[PDB]
Amino acid sequence: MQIFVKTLTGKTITLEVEPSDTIENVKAKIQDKEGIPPDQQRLIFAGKQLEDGRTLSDYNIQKESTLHLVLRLRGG
Amino acid sequence: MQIFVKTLTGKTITLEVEPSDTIENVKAKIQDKEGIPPDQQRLIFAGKQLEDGRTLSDYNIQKESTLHLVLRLRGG
Amino acid sequence: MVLEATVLVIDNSEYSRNGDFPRTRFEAQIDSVEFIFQAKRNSNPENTVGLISGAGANPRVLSTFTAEFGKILAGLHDTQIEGKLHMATALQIAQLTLKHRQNKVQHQRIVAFVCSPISDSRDELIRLAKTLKKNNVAVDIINFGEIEQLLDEFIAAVNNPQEETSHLLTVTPGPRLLYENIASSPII
Amino acid sequence: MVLEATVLVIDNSEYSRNGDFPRTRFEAQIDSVEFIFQAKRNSNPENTVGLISGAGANPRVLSTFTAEFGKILAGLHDTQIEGKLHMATALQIAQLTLKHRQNKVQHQRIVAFVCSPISDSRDELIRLAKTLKKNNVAVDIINFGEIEQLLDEFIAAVNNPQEETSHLLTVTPGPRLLYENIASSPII
């Protein structure tokens, strides 16, 4: 299974995942495509916000779904 | 003399001004082109910020110069 | 569907005029009010909806509860982009409006758009959230433009567990307009 | 031109990765450090420049004063996008660095990029500004990305009237890169 990540800059990168993958794993796959650590990652799909430890089966994420990546801002 | 105003949305509108016009006047000319009141206007040209009561001769603004309009945010 | 009085609060703050949500975040919000009204109205003929500018210099009631599309439209024209968003105040006047909704069999719901940085305290907002929950009001925030979620902790606070009535919509600039994303959301 | 030691502070905060300033605000800032260094260096062979990450979890000195392009480059590689911008702290370590600049005939100057919302108080920043002025340090802020000016009131405070050494550059996303806008600025 392959899925999509659209950053705010419109760049869509493709990832290879299978439906049981944790979001925390997806954020690591996203890290080695874009060089941004998971503690800086926030994932938005279907209007909701993807949570760590939940998996993509949980969110009914399926082939060619497009995830949105925005800045997870911590202490600001 | 005609000049240019580029909003953050890339829309460039053209205004007819003469070199002695106050900035506070330009912001009114900008108001009736774009429906945004001067107390909400901030003007950026040559890296500096255009001040009310100064005129365009003051800033050495000349024909086809491009002004940038950004939000003047007050109480936030 | 369900019989309810709902209050739409819009962010009319200086942030409302922006490219990212076509045509502008404000206008996005207008098409959204129109859609949402026409929706709630046809899920049950007895629904009635209200409108609240949530910014400016003091949140104000633009229209009381109606079935009338004309006075939603009259209240929608005659508001203005200006000021900053006063969230907790807006939420207070929304709650005050719902308490006095005619026909008390109507479930209470407020739907609010936030396209601004939230000036209010997290504490005031959480108190307010717990209060709202206690008074049996459900809340839907629409979160676009600057996306900061506080909002997650708010909806967390205000949600009624045994009937899950309170949703957060986080939406990013994109191909679809804002009202479409709202149509497909759990706010339906 | 003028003999001076200058310190470059960069905003390496999570805001640094952004589309609006190509390629990213961080990278904008790297090309800018390179340019600025190579510039100051050729206005006078005696100039020396330093580098400071101004974000992360605690502003840190990436390179001490040099004429050496290699260790500006070595210090520029080995920083990271992370954390929030701690402005007044960054300004403190910049000032501490300048006091101890070898060759005290060098006029003192700090040049700082702010692409983040400023978490610091206006009061701390104004105190800091008055202090800086008192210690005969000149300051150039580069203001891009989120443009909030506080910065105007800061540069107002810190500027030395009788020799006007302190400039604010407010720059908007556009056709030219950030380093070009900096080349044409009064920071030259």
Author numbering:
A (entry chain U), B (entry chain U): 1 to 76
C (entry chain A), D (entry chain A): 1 to 149, 153 to 191
What does the paper say about this structure?
Rpn10 decodes K48-linked poly-Ub-signals into proteasomal degradation. Rpn10 is composed from an N-terminal vWA (Von Willebrand factor type A) domain that was shown to participate in proteasome binding, and a C-terminal Ubiquitin Interacting Motif (UIM) domain that binds Ub through Ub-I44 hydrophobic patch. Large pools of a proteasome-free Rpn10 have been observed in the cytosols of several model organisms, and has been postulated that these shuttle ubiquitylated substrates or other Ub-shuttles, including Rad23, Dsk2 and Ddi1, to the proteasome1113.
The ubiquitylation site was clearly observed at K84, a residue previously identified in vivo as the major ubiquitylation site7. Detailed examination of this postulated biological interface shows a network of hydrophobic interactions between I147 of Rpn10 and Ub-I44 patch. Superimposing our determined Ub-Rpn10 structure onto the Rpn10 from four cryo-EM models of the proteasome2425 revealed that the conjugated Ub clashes into Rpn9. Collectively, the crystal structure and its interpretation in the context of the cryo-EM data, the in vivo and the in vitro experiments—point towards a scenario where K84 ubiquitylation dissociates Rpn10 from the proteasome due to steric clashes with Rpn9.
